[PDB]
């Protein structure tokens, strides 16, 4: 995120980090419950990637993080890789996340919900902070 | 990428106003936000766009794509969760 602000640790409890065997943070994801991860399809997750939960600082050696194995990758077949339309993949965990003060689920909308233009919403991430 | 978790507040825009910037690139299952002085960037993909409704944070977008450059004058394109949520319900249901 460009022009963000540092979040209050443990405050976006559903915010996971996608990392590779190497330990490289490659995309983000959101917990929708204890066994299930939501992310983009273009992030190209595989079963050797690790879902990392309860992170604030990828630099810390002292946080109580969970490194969780991916069992299955559910790529929405309505994903149109040329278009980048319907960009969503579900990731089923091999080991259920343990819910805590810092690991929790985000709520999902029902398909018939309205989110009007001009509404102030919030985005989180470990994205480039400057281009 | 920064070590520390960042956040940013920003506005949803309409698809219409959104094709004022992205045109035919903007499809039905995508939702736009930003162009506010903040921008999602490389490294944010898959991460959430949350709006609070009746006291709780609802997943309204999934960070998808935008300005090659993370221009903060260019709106970010996100996945539109309302359009994909039945697929999610259908998937959790089967497996």
């Amino acid at each position: 995120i460009v022009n963000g602000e540092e979040a209050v640790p443990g405050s976006w409890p559903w915010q996971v980090s996608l990392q590779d065997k190497t330990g490289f943070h490659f995309c983000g994801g959101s917990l929708i419950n204890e066994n299930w991860v939501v992310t983009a399809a273009h992030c190209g997750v595989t079963t050797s990637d690790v879902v990392v939960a309860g992170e604030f600082d990828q630099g810390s050696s002292s946080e109580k993080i969970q490194k969780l194995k991916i069992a299955k990758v559910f790529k929405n077949s309505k994903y149109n890789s040329l278009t980048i339309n319907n960009d969503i993949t579900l990731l089923k965990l091999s080991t259920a996340a343990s819910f805590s003060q810092t690991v929790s689920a985000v709520c999902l909308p029902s398909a018939s919900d309205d989110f009007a233009a001009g509404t102030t919403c919030v985005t989180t991430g470990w994205g480039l902070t400057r281009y | 990428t920064p070590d520390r978790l960042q956040q940013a507040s920003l506005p949803l825009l309409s698809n219409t106003n959104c094709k004022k910037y992205w045109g035919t690139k903007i499809k039905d299952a995508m939702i736009c936000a930003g162009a506010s002085g903040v921008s999602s960037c490389m490294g944010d993909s898959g991460g959430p766009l949350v709006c609070k409704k009746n006291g709780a944070w609802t997943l309204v977008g999934i960070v998808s794509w935008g300005s090659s450059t993370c221009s903060t004058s260019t709106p970010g394109v996100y996945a539109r969760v309302t359009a994909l949520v039945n697929w999610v319900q259908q998937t959790l249901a089967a497996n």
């Binding site: 979040a7 209050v8 640790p9 443990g10 405050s11 976006w12 409890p13 805590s100 003060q101 810092t102 929790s104 689920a105 985000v106 709520c107 999902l108 919030v122 | 956040q7 507040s9 609070k52 006291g55 709780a56 944070w57 609802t58």
Partner: peptide, 10 residues
């Protein structure tokens, strides 16, 4: 869901 145990401060 949706109600962090530690309040996001904006």
């Amino acid at each position: 869901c949706g109600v962090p145990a530690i309040q996001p401060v904006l």
